[PDB]
Amino acid sequence: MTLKELYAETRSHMQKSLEVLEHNLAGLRTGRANPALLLHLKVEYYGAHVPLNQIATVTAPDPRTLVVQSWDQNALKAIEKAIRDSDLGLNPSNKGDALYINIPPLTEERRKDLVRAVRQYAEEGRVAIRNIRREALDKLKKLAKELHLSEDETKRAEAEIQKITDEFIAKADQLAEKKEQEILG
RNA sequence: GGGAACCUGGGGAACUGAAACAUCUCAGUACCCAGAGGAGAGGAAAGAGAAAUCGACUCCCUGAGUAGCGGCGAGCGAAAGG
RNA sequence: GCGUGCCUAUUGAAGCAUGAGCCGGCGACUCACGGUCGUGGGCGAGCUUAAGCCGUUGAGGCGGAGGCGUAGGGAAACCGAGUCCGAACAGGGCGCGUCCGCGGCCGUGGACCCGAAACCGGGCGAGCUAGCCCUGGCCAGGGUGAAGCUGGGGUGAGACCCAGUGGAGGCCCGAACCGGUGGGGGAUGCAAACCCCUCGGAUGAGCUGGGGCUAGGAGUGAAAAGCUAACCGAGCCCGGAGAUAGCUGGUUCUCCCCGAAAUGACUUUAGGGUCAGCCUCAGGCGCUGACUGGGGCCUGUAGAGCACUGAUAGGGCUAGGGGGCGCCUACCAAACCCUGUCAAACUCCGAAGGGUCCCAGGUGGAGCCUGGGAGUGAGGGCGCGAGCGAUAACGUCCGCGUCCGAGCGCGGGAACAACCGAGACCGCCAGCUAAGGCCCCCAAGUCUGGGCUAAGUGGUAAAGGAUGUGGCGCCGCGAAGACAGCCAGUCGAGUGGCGCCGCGCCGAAAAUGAUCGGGGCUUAAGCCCAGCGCCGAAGCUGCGGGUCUGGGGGAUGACCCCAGGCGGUAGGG
RNA sequence: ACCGACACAGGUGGGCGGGUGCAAGAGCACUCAGGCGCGCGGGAGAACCCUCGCCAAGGAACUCUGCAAGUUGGCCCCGUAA
RNA sequence: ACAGCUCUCUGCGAACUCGUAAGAGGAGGUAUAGGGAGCGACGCUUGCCCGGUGCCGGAAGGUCAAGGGGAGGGGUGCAAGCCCCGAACCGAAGCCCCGGUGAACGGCGGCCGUAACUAUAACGGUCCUAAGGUAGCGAAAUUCCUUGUCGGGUAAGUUCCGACCUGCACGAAAAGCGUAACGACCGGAGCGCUGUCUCGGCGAGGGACCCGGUGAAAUUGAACUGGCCGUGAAGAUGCGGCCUACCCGUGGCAGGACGAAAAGACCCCGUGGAGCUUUACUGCAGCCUGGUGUUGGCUCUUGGUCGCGCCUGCGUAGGAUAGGUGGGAGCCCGGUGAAAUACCACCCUGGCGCGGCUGGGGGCCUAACCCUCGGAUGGGGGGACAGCGCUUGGCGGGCAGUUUGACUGGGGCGGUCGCCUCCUAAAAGGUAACGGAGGCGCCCAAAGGUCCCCUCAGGCGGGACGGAAAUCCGCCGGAGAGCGCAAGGGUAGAAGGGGGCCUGACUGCGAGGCCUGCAAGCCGAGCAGGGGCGAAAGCCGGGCCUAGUGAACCGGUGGUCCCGUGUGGAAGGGCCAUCGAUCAACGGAUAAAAGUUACCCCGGGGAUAACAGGCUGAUCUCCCCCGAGCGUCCACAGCGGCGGGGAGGUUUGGCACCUCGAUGUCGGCUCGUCGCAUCCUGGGGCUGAAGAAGGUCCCAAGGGUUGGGCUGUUCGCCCAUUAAAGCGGCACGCGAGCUGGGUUCAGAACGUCGUGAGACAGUUCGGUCUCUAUCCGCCACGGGCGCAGGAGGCUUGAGGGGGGCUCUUCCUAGUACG
Numbered sequence A: 001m002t003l004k005e006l007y008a009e010t011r012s013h014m015q016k017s018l019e020v021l022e023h024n025l026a027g028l029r030t031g032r033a034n035p036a037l038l039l040h041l042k043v044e045y046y047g048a049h050v051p052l053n054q055i056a057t058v059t060a061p062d063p064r065t066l067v068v069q070s071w072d073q074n075a076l077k078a079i080e081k082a083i084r085d086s087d088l089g090l091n092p093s094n095k096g097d098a099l100y101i102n103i104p105p106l107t108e109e110r111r112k113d114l115v116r117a118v119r120q121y122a123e124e125g126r127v128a129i130r131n132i133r134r135e136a137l138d139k140l141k142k143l144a145k146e147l148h149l150s151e152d153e154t155k156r157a158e159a160e161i162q163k164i165t166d167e168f169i170a171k172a173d174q175l176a177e178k179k180e181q182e183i184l185g
Numbered sequence B: 001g002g003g004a005a006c007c008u009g010g011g012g013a014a015c016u017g018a019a020a021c022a023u024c025u026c027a028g029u030a031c032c033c034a035g036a037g038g039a040g041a042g043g044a045a046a047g048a049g050a051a052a053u054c055g056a057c058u059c060c061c062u063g064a065g066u067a068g069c070g071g072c073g074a075g076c077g078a079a080a081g082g
Numbered sequence C: 001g002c003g004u005g006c007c008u009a010u011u012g013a014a015g016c017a018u019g020a021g022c023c024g025g026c027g028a029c030u031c032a033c034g035g036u037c038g039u040g041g042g043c044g045a046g047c048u049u050a051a052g053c054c055g056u057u058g059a060g061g062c063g064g065a066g067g068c069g070u071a072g073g074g075a076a077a078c079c080g081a082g083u084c085c086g087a088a089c090a091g092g093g094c095g096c097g098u099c100c101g102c103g104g105c106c107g108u109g110g111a112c113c114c115g116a117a118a119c120c121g122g123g124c125g126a127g128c129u130a131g132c133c134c135u136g137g138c139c140a141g142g143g144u145g146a147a148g149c150u151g152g153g154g155u156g157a158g159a160c161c162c163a164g165u166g167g168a169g170g171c172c173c174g175a176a177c178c179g180g181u182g183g184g185g186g187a188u189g190c191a192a193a194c195c196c197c198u199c200g201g202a203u204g205a206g207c208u209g210g211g212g213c214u215a216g217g218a219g220u221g222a223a224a225a226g227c228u229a230a231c232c233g234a235g236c237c238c239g240g241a242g243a244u245a246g247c248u249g250g251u252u253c254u255c256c257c258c259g260a261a262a263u264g265a266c267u268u269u270a271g272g273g274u275c276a277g278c279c280u281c282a283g284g285c286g287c288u289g290a291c292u293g294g295g296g297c298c299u300g301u302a303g304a305g306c307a308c309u310g311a312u313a314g315g316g317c318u319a320g321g322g323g324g325c326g327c328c329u330a331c332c333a334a335a336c337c338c339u340g341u342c343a344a345a346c347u348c349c350g351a352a353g354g355g356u357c358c359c360a361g362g363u364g365g366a367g368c369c370u371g372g373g374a375g376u377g378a379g380g381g382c383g384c385g386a387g388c389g390a391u392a393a394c395g396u397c398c399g400c401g402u403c404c405g406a407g408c409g410c411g412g413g414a415a416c417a418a419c420c421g422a423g424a425c426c427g428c429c430a431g432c433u434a435a436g437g438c439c440c441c442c443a444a445g446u447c448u449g450g451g452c453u454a455a456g457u458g459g460u461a462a463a464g465g466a467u468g469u470g471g472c473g474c475c476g477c478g479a480a481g482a483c484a485g486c487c488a489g490u491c492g493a494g495u496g497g498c499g500c501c502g503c504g505c506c507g508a509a510a511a512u513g514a515u516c517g518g519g520g521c522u523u524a525a526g527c528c529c530a531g532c533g534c535c536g537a538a539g540c541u542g543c544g545g546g547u548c549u550g551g552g553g554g555a556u557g558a559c560c561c562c563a564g565g566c567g568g569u570a571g572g573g
Numbered sequence D: 001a002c003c004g005a006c007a008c009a010g011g012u013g014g015g016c017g018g019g020u021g022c023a024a025g026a027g028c029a030c031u032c033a034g035g036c037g038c039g040c041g042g043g044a045g046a047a048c049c050c051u052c053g054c055c056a057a058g059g060a061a062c063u064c065u066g067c068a069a070g071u072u073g074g075c076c077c078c079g080u081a082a
Numbered sequence E: 001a002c003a004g005c006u007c008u009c010u011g012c013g014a015a016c017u018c019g020u021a022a023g024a025g026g027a028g029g030u031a032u033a034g035g036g037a038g039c040g041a042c043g044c045u046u047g048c049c050c051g052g053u054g055c056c057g058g059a060a061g062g063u064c065a066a067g068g069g070g071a072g073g074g075g076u077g078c079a080a081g082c083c084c085c086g087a088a089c090c091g092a093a094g095c096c097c098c099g100g101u102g103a104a105c106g107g108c109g110g111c112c113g114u115a116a117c118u119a120u121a122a123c124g125g126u127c128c129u130a131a132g133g134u135a136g137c138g139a140a141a142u143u144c145c146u147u148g149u150c151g152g153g154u155a156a157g158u159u160c161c162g163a164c165c166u167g168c169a170c171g172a173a174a175a176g177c178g179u180a181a182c183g184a185c186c187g188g189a190g191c192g193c194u195g196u197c198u199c200g201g202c203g204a205g206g207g208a209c210c211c212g213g214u215g216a217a218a219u220u221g222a223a224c225u226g227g228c229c230g231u232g233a234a235g236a237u238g239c240g241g242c243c244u245a246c247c248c249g250u251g252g253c254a255g256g257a258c259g260a261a262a263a264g265a266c267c268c269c270g271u272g273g274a275g276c277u278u279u280a281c282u283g284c285a286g287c288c289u290g291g292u293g294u295u296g297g298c299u300c301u302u303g304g305u306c307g308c309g310c311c312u313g314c315g316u317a318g319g320a321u322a323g324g325u326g327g328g329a330g331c332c333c334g335g336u337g338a339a340a341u342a343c344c345a346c347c348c349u350g351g352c353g354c355g356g357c358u359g360g361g362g363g364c365c366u367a368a369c370c371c372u373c374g375g376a377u378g379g380g381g382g383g384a385c386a387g388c389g390c391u392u393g394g395c396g397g398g399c400a401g402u403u404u405g406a407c408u409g410g411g412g413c414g415g416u417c418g419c420c421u422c423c424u425a426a427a428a429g430g431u432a433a434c435g436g437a438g439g440c441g442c443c444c445a446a447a448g449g450u451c452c453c454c455u456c457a458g459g460c461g462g463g464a465c466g467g468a469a470a471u472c473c474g475c476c477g478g479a480g481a482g483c484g485c486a487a488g489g490g491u492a493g494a495a496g497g498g499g500g501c502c503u504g505a506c507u508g509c510g511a512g513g514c515c516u517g518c519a520a521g522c523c524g525a526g527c528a529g530g531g532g533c534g535a536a537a538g539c540c541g542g543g544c545c546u547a548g549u550g551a552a553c554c555g556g557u558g559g560u561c562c563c564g565u566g567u568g569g570a571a572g573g574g575c576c577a578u579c580g581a582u583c584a585a586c587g588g589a590u591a592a593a594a595g596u597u598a599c600c601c602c603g604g605g606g607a608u609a610a611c612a613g614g615c616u617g618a619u620c621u622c623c624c625c626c627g628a629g630c631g632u633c634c635a636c637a638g639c640g641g642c643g644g645g646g647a648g649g650u651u652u653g654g655c656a657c658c659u660c661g662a663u664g665u666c667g668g669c670u671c672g673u674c675g676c677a678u679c680c681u682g683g684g685g686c687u688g689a690a691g692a693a694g695g696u697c698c699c700a701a702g703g704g705u706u707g708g709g710c711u712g713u714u715c716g717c718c719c720a721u722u723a724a725a726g727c728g729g730c731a732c733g734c735g736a737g738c739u740g741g742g743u744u745c746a747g748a749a750c751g752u753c754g755u756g757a758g759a760c761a762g763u764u765c766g767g768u769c770u771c772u773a774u775c776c777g778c779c780a781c782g783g784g785c786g787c788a789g790g791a792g793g794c795u796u797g798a799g800g801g802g803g804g805c806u807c808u809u810c811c812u813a814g815u816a817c818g
């Protein structure tokens, strides 16, 4: 309706496009010495792919492994029933109310199968935003042309978007930016 | 054919002014062409204009910046009669 | 010792804004006809003549056509000291010189003087340059080797293939010839388009000699708005023409008097103008002026205040509403109540002030009236009060005021339009004072008592730190003699604690060489509270002199006394 | 001696335009016939500039850019890809 | 430009062009040709949308200018008359309307939902359209984010090439995608070779310099012309305090004299100027078009129409095809109906019958006009047409003259432009800003006059339908209701709520004020005239009150007395009443008007922008306070919430004070110099310091602070090293020292917007950078004099300047610590 609520409907409409970015990184075979790499998992349970960060508690004991202290025995049961079913290629455990799964890093060829695809979400992410800028500015057009402004009352708008788009595009380049280390280094 | 201007006919601007500008103005000016000559034109009423009047024409002074004309603006502007 | 050129334009210039090498000459508010005034004469209920006519050879008459003036009022008819609107016989609106000379200003003409970009007419150019027509030349040498023909090959006949001859082409290489790619030079040149190296085309849409043709809103153009006689978005010359310029510049002798504005209103107006405001001169009226005292009103700001309007933190009381809902539990939460507050657009209340009317003082480059001449209509700083700004700006708009402008004349402030003092006729080798100062530069107290400060603070900064120092307080409570060390007695006294006042330290880094104006100051040459004295300006007295008004001498003699004003740009006299 | 304000480093159509050598030629070099030595000179031997010759090693690090400069260059003969 | 493609025009006296015309090109041509337009060999191709626009086609209708036409009206004369307006209706072109048309101007979308991992969406629903971009191409001479991501080339590649397509904003004849051959065209690589460079050196010639001859120019207030901190109109040789410094030159260097040269080219202002554009205004040329003059014959055929002759009207009964009103009875009523006939009439309805006056059409003609033919007194063909005169209406950037407002913290854009109500506003008024927050361009025949009465809003209880208000009753409540609508003031002792009569919401006027520059606006006593209500004293010339509106000019309607061009009356004026304005840019230039320039010009300005300086310091970089809370314990080893205080003038800004008769504007090169907040190397302090390393704070600039790739880049980003590869000041130092890659002149193109000419803080290739230094300053080298005799030598050094760096390794010692 106006720049006021708009400049915020971008910092809200760009948020999500960023969201997924994080999402598509953890789903990646990093040093896999992290728990979150699991919780996202849509685990089929009681008739609904239910995110693991809701069916249990994953926390890697040490670097070399993770534990899913799955409260209810049964839950844990139908849990493995999905952490493996991921092409990845791991194997957990039916030990106690928890799930012991190893973390085995691998070859360089495994680095391209991980690093290359990342410098790909690097795009899907930067871009998803690029559009929240394209689609933004356009409503900024019809806006000050409906509402009346100055060729400058508008530039202020026009570039603010830009400073916002740029501000958010950072929480991306710079985001994955770190995990790239957890992957590489 | 020529002739310093001066005169008549045939054509004929704009800048300007109106504090813009198109009617209007400058202006029938400038200039162009023809023609007449010591001058040229005009000249004996199919006039004038309200006076039982006047009596070819042309020039001067008044009439008069009047009567009027006018995007009733800028501005233009007679005639009878004396 | 003291001292920032001249003009110009400006809120403001020495200005690092404008113009000017220097000297001499030329060089800009005029005339004509109308108007409006003031003024010197003539004639007066009238005054005066235009063209023309007669005389003159630097004689003046005559000429009353005509023009103003004697009545105004009404759109007009018309009426008339009235008239007009009107039914009114209410009312209301309008009511007494010419002719010359001269000065001021206005209208009109180029009308203060220069200066455009352009516009319009008539002409002059294609001996440059563009296109084209006619008639003539020119293009070393080398290269590749098309079509054609001819001989052989193949076929049913062919097509088609081979050699050979042959000599095509907006073909190739490269001089002349015609261009002008890239670079350097040249840049008051060799030259207002050049030179050197380099590079393109060179039988073609080629280059060139002579003769011809098309032109100014026109030509011509392998197209750039290119070219048309070295500048072309419309050539050149001549005339209209002294186009117009709400802009820029310039605008000449002296002394005297007064002196602005930089605002309001309306402007296709906003750096212009019309009216008003403010200056000035004339004549007219004469204490009403500015300012002050005393009285009587209107008034709604500074404060303050919640009675309205609204906002407000908390607490109580209590709807209705959360959560168990039945009791209860959190002001989560309306009105109400106190408790404390907030507000340009709230005020129960309300100042000081301001304004205004009658009376009183008030003789002043006061006012009030009629009129001639204006300029100005960018303002700027500073105090105060408000907006905008960010409780920013040498910011910005307003308000009272002031000062600069125009007081850049003088002292102080180091230097400096507006900060302090203070209104500069002139002259003097006099004297006392303002502001500021009084140790040396530099005038006058290293003046006198009384403290404070040790950082050069002074000599120019904050929140906030800190037993820096000097001076006050009330608090403990130490013979129920610990406050500091050594087992606590001896030791036998000033030790803890907050918190106020003065000066001070830290906090605290900037760009060419440093500093408070310099030197140099510490019981000061700093700072605070006292006291007497000097210095110091163009301020005021002293002596003399110039000048204009006002007021008396006065025998006008313009000739001495008397009391005042005399900075000044635009401007007026 | 013509057009360029000049005794101008620019411009101006046609014919002749020798010899030797170089693949040829009106190209280049030298020189016949012929003409000229450009209407200020003399010295010195710095910076710097103009125009010109050279370089160790490196060989585009230069720079906007190999701009410039260098390399290659004639003829004969092989031999020449997409 | 080009061949070549396409659309289009043109039947010959061609179209088109020049010209007033004659005439001429066209062309001594004839559609296999000529003109106009776009595209630009050649290969494959060239989609969809005729709603709007243009053009082609439509013998019907709609509208329409003259002219024809005259029902009807007015003016005058005693009149025959003469004069005027004047409806029907017939009337071109154009426009409207109906079709067609894209190698004509042009145009060629969006929003929801859905696949058994997810994603995504072939598929569905839906909104609008004239129809929603096909082939091919794609971060491109087009891609804003952008150096998009990947891959290749490189040590390293914002460029380049290959891909992906999320095409800000390709795309089919302003052509699309390709293409061998071609280019002094623009980009990326290589190899060869070099002074281009690291990195500078030597040498040659012509100048520069010295000597003899000749001998300029721009500029120039006057000169006796130094540095620093200050200062001043805010960048000083010329003021102030201080600091230096003998006089005068020769060769050089360029930092300064805001150096010179151009009355700034950008910027704005001027109601300044030109070239251009169009669906801005207005006209002109030309073209189309009706009537006519030129201009005539003979026929065919239908109109409008006035003279006339005639026939002509079938409601229900009916003597039945009554038109109508009169006369009227021999050439009938009757009976009945709305009306009675046998007959003569005057006329509405309507058609035919011979004439007039005029019209329109379609034919043939020849003899005017035209063109032609071995030279014609004539013959061919066209033919009342064409051409030409006049007049009617329209098309008409082809051409012309012009208009395209102002304010405004430059301008443009956005906003506003008059009136009303508060505050601002400092206790009379008044009063600024693009200051804060709202209204008006009306409404009322009752909402008005006056007389007569009556009184709210809310609150609490009682109450049939009944919220928390319908309507009743009951107390209480001075004002918070109401007062037509904004706001303020006022108000119940009425302006409010209700009832009764009325139309003073009059005509004549107006003492006297308010306000005020003018002109406008504002209240209004009372007299006269005739009225309304009231018993009356009395009130009523509009509305509780301020907004609710517009000078004159020009026309329009009414009326009255005045004028009425020899006189009379008219035509037409005046006076009075009243009307036509978003003249709303609202004190109003015209009846009448938009753009554009980088093709541009003049006059002006630092009255006003961009660069730079200055003031400011929000923003900016920096350091400081308070100390939540992180640090395994523990505010400060290292950190710091929310919050607060300052410093600096390097960022982005605000202001517009110098300079617009000119202060050359990014980057690079060269030469630097200064600050410390320090990147190295020196010292030191704590450390959550073992050592070796670091972290962090404190001192401290003396000196150092590399070479490359990319980009114009500064800045970054990488490659290889380093003790380190520090930030910032000097007009973001430095163009009279160089460079011009960037950027802002003219050329061209892409995307883009625009109908257009042209435009763009978009791109892209191109594109002129001025021999002489006089003064200050600086580098060198002199002449003069001075230094109280005149000399030849050798030194003293007050004073200044140059220079100061840093790494690696080996011993100590593999020791100390571990």
Ligand SMILES: [Mg+2]
Pocket (backbone or CB within 6 Å): none
């Ligand atoms: Mg003659």
Ligand SMILES: [Mg+2]
Pocket (backbone or CB within 6 Å): B017, B018, B025
């Ligand atoms: Mg005019």
Ligand SMILES: [Mg+2]
Pocket (backbone or CB within 6 Å): B021, B022
């Ligand atoms: Mg006009």
Ligand SMILES: [Mg+2]
Pocket (backbone or CB within 6 Å): B021, B022
């Ligand atoms: Mg005109």
Ligand SMILES: [Mg+2]
Pocket (backbone or CB within 6 Å): B039
């Ligand atoms: Mg004679």
Ligand SMILES: [Mg+2]
Pocket (backbone or CB within 6 Å): none
């Ligand atoms: Mg005669």
Ligand SMILES: [Mg+2]
Pocket (backbone or CB within 6 Å): none
């Ligand atoms: Mg006769």
Ligand SMILES: [Mg+2]
Pocket (backbone or CB within 6 Å): B059, B060
């Ligand atoms: Mg005469």
Ligand SMILES: [Mg+2]
Pocket (backbone or CB within 6 Å): none
């Ligand atoms: Mg008269």
Ligand SMILES: [Mg+2]
Pocket (backbone or CB within 6 Å): none
């Ligand atoms: Mg006469």
Ligand SMILES: [Mg+2]
Pocket (backbone or CB within 6 Å): none
């Ligand atoms: Mg001096």
Ligand SMILES: [Mg+2]
Pocket (backbone or CB within 6 Å): C008, C249
């Ligand atoms: Mg002047």
Ligand SMILES: [Mg+2]
Pocket (backbone or CB within 6 Å): none
């Ligand atoms: Mg100024």
Ligand SMILES: [Mg+2]
Pocket (backbone or CB within 6 Å): none
């Ligand atoms: Mg000077």
Ligand SMILES: [Mg+2]
Pocket (backbone or CB within 6 Å): C017, E659
């Ligand atoms: Mg200047």
Ligand SMILES: [Mg+2]
Pocket (backbone or CB within 6 Å): none
């Ligand atoms: Mg000067």
